[PDB]
Design an enzyme around this catalytic site. Structure first.
Site, short mmCIF file in Angstrom:
data_model
loop_
_atom_site.label_atom_id
_atom_site.label_comp_id
_atom_site.label_asym_id
_atom_site.label_seq_id
_atom_site.Cartn_x
_atom_site.Cartn_y
_atom_site.Cartn_z
N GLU A 265 0.84 -1.17 -0.11
CA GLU A 265 -0.10 -0.15 0.09
C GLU A 265 0.89 1.27 0.03
OE1 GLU A 265 -3.80 -0.01 1.80
OE2 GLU A 265 -3.74 -2.08 2.57
N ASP A 266 1.79 1.41 -0.83
CA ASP A 266 2.42 2.41 -1.16
C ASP A 266 3.30 2.88 0.15
OD1 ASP A 266 2.40 3.46 -3.82
OD2 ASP A 266 0.27 4.21 -3.42
N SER A 267 4.16 1.97 0.53
CA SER A 267 5.08 2.06 1.55
C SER A 267 6.50 1.42 1.07
CB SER A 267 4.61 1.33 2.79
OG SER A 267 4.85 0.04 2.92
#
Ligand SMILES: [Mg+2]
Ligand SMILES: [Zn+2]
Ligand SMILES: [Zn+2]
Ligand SMILES: [Zn+2]
Lengths: 263, 45, 49, 113, 49, 49, 66, 61
Positions: free
Chosen positions: C1-3
């Site tokens: 999740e976009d980390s």
RNA sequence: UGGCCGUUUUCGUUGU
């Protein structure tokens, strides 16, 4: 059973071939020598005064990365364990730099070479900064202009690459096996075919390509690892290898001592 | 007891909180205090 | 999740470490000709609160 | 502001022993080891060999969370051997293998230059 | 006398770097403190391509 | 606070009652909250900040 | 600002080589060449010396308060 | 207690030889704040070095 | 020798 075959040796870079050992072992050796090789590097930077355009923290950091000849660090105890009050010359190697520029024109360039060893548990060959050559000025720490003075009273200690990346003696470990993918552990992406896209490794000639009619071996295992080591110069590659092996050995020995003592 | 440093001529002097805030030597009106004497530390990390 | 996962050593090598400057402000204040406020080290007996 | 001490990834507190064993009562001759200050570097090596042994029924470990420096090893040797002996046997085996590798490398480097 | 201090923001740390001391337009003391520190990337930062 | 204790938890906007829940406490280092990657949907959350 | 000490990715000390790189560039050698003669093969290092910007000269161009 | 707000070092422990300032001195476990890191650590009174008129004096000042 | 006090109102910029 374990074998060894060095391919190209040098002061810093070692390009060898290790075979006939569990891949777990080769990987753990790589890891341990990347992480668990005791060394020496600047720890406490005490700045008597500064006049540069560089933040004091910025210099303290830049010093943190300076490689220190640590060929005898194995003799130096851990500053955590040493019993002396404050530091001592048997648990700490003191280096000091005091450079300056004078005159209204030109720019001075303080290099690593200007660093100086004040004390150290001599004659242990520790504390000296590393250099490629004798005349090689080396690492650039700062630039000074008119009236700008830099003075510092550095300290080093014995820490490990776990606690920071300055204690890393290893720079870049190459590592591979099965250059033709006999064990097939990788599936090759492609647009037309695997072979006409992916260029071959440099160890291509070191193991014969599988025969077209050759069929899979389900008992096959990884056997020949080609790991090319390199170092910053803080320790000789051979010293790196031997020290890593010794550290791993003593660690397992500690574990076995714990096991036996527990009862 | 509380040294200073000019921003134009960079010559050091002091004051006792009663002299007007001016450079003694060149008369400039911008000054800075100078580094303390207690010791400064860094972990270089 | 976009980390993202960051190489710890890459940080320790001076990756994306930046500086942070804060400037404070203050000045002596005047309530009149004879009333001013003076920068000073205040003793506890002479001052309150 | 709440980061752990980077010297604590390898240093051990006094009150906690380096290693801690827990017998696995739900199956026979199985044990669970609670390590300290260790990671894949040691666990992978121990596990590979202890698997290579003949009289080991089940052996495994896991790294709970990379933010903590300890791992847990599951070991279950056949009734023939108690697990402690199998583990220390593997320890000795790697010890000697490493010693042999070191000696060969020393000789090879001597001759090479 | 009453305290009129200028405490550091409780959520900040660092080292005082450069103290200024000059007159304002109206001739009172008029100070400026540039505190500094370096920000290490860690868990919870932000980044972007 | 100790591990396993109960505490609320929330996001804004709290559109549907699946935007508030009661979790359990686990003490950890660093200065961020962390959620199991599954529970993001009920909070309609993501780690882009 | 200034050429860093250790390459972030690998760790191969590079800072000391910056001056030599400038020197090689002086006589007109193409950048790839100069990076070659320094023995920088892994582009994880080539990226720096190719694309570092020197500011410390700019920051010094101001007369120090001293 | 006249032993507050003084520069103090650590002679033994995991931070051997770090300059620190005594922020809180409740009792028998001195809370000292360091300089290199942005944090304060508790530490027993006998594991510190206290500045004195001359040299560094252990816990007898 | 405890006990213990730090503005509002605007506007702005941003963040999810
Ligand atoms: Mg978003
Ligand atoms: Zn000592
Ligand atoms: Zn002046
Ligand atoms: Zn690199």
């Amino acid at each position: 059973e374990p074998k060894v075959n060095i391919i190209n040796a040098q002061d810093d870079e070692v390009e060898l071939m290790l075979s006939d050992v569990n891949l777990s072992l080769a990987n753990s050796l790589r890891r341990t020598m990347l992480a668990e090789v005791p060394t020496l590097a600047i720890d406490l930077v005490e700045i008597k005064m500064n006049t540069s355009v560089l933040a004091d923290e910025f210099i303290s950091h830049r010093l943190g990365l300076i490689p220190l000849v640590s060929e005898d660090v194995e003799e130096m105890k851990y500053s955590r364990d040493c019993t002396c009050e404050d530091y001592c010359d048997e648990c700490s190697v003191v280096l000091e730099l005091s450079a300056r520029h004078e005159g209204e024109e030109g720019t001075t360039d303080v290099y690593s070479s200007s660093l100086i060893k004040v004390s150290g548990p001599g004659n242990l060959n520790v504390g000296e900064p590393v250099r490629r050559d004798d005349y090689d000025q080396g690492i650039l720490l700062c630039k000074l202009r008119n009236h700008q003075e830099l003075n510092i009273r550095c300290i080093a200690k014995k820490g490990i690459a776990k606690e920071h990346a300055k204690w890393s003696p290893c720079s870049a470990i190459a590592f591979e096996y099965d250059p033709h993918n006999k064990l097939k552990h990788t599936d090759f992406w492609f647009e037309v075919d695997a072979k006409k896209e992916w260029p071959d490794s440099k160890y291509a000639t070191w193991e014969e390509p599988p025969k077209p009619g050759e069929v899979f071996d389900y008992k096959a295992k990884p056997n020949r690892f080609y790991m090319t080591v390199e170092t910053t110069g803080s320790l000789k590659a051979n010293q790196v290898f031997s020290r890593g092996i010794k550290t791993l050995q003593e660690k397992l020995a500690n574990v076995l001592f714990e096991l036996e003592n527990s009862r | 007891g509380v040294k200073y440093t000019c921003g134009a001529c960079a010559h050091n002097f002091s004051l006792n909180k009663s002299d007007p805030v001016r450079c003694k030597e060149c008369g400039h009106r911008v000054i800075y205090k100078a580094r303390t004497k207690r010791m400064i530390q860094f972990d270089a990390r | 999740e976009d980390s993202m996962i960051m190489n710890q050593s890459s940080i320790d090598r001076g990756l994306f470490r930046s500086l942070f400057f804060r400037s404070y402000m203050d000045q002596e204040k005047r309530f009149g000709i004879s009333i001013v406020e003076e920068f000073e080290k205040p003793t506890r007996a002479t001052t309150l609160r | 502001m709440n980061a752990p001490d980077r010297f604590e990834l390898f240093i051990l507190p006094d009150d906690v022993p380096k290693l801690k064993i827990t017998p696995d009562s739900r199956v026979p001759n199985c044990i669970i080891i609670k390590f300290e200050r260790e990671d894949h570097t040691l666990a992978n090596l121990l596990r590979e060999e202890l698997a290579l042994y003949p009289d080991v029924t089940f052996v495994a470990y896991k790294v709970e969370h990379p933010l903590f420096a300890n791992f847990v090893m599951r070991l279950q040797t056949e009734e023939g051997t108690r697990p402690k002996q199998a583990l220390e046997r593997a320890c000795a085996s790697i010890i000697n293998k490493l010693k042999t590798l070191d000696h060969k490398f020393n000789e090879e480097w001597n001759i090479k230059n | 006398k009453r305290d009129a201090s200028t405490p550091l923001r409780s959520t900040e740390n660092g080292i005082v770097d450069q103290v200024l001391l000059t007159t304002n337009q109206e001739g009172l003391k008029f100070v400026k403190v540039r505190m500094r520190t370096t920000k290490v990337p860690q868990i919870g930062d932000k980044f972007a391509s | 606070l100790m591990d396993d204790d109960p505490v609320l938890f929330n996001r804004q906007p709290s559109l549907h009652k699946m935007s508030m829940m009661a979790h359990r406490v686990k003490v950890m280092p660093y200065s961020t909250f962390r959620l199991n990657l599954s529970v993001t949907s009920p909070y309609n959350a993501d780690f882009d900040g | 600002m200034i050429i860093p000490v250790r390459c972030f990715s690998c760790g191969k000390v590079v800072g000391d080589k910056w001056d030599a790189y400038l020197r090689l560039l002086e006589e007109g050698k193409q950048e790839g060449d100069a990076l070659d003669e320094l023995k920088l093969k892994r582009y994880c290092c080539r990226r720096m010396v190719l694309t570092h910007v020197d500011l410390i000269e700019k920051f010094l161009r101001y007369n120090p308060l001293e | 207690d006249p032993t507050l707000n003084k520069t103090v070092k650590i002679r033994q422990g995991g931070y051997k030889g770090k300059i620190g300032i005594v922020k809180e001195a409740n009792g028998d476990r001195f809370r000292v704040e360091l300089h290199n890191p942005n944090k304060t650590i508790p530490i027993p009174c006998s594991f510190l070095l206290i500045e004195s008129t001359h040299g560094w004096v252990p816990y007898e000042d």
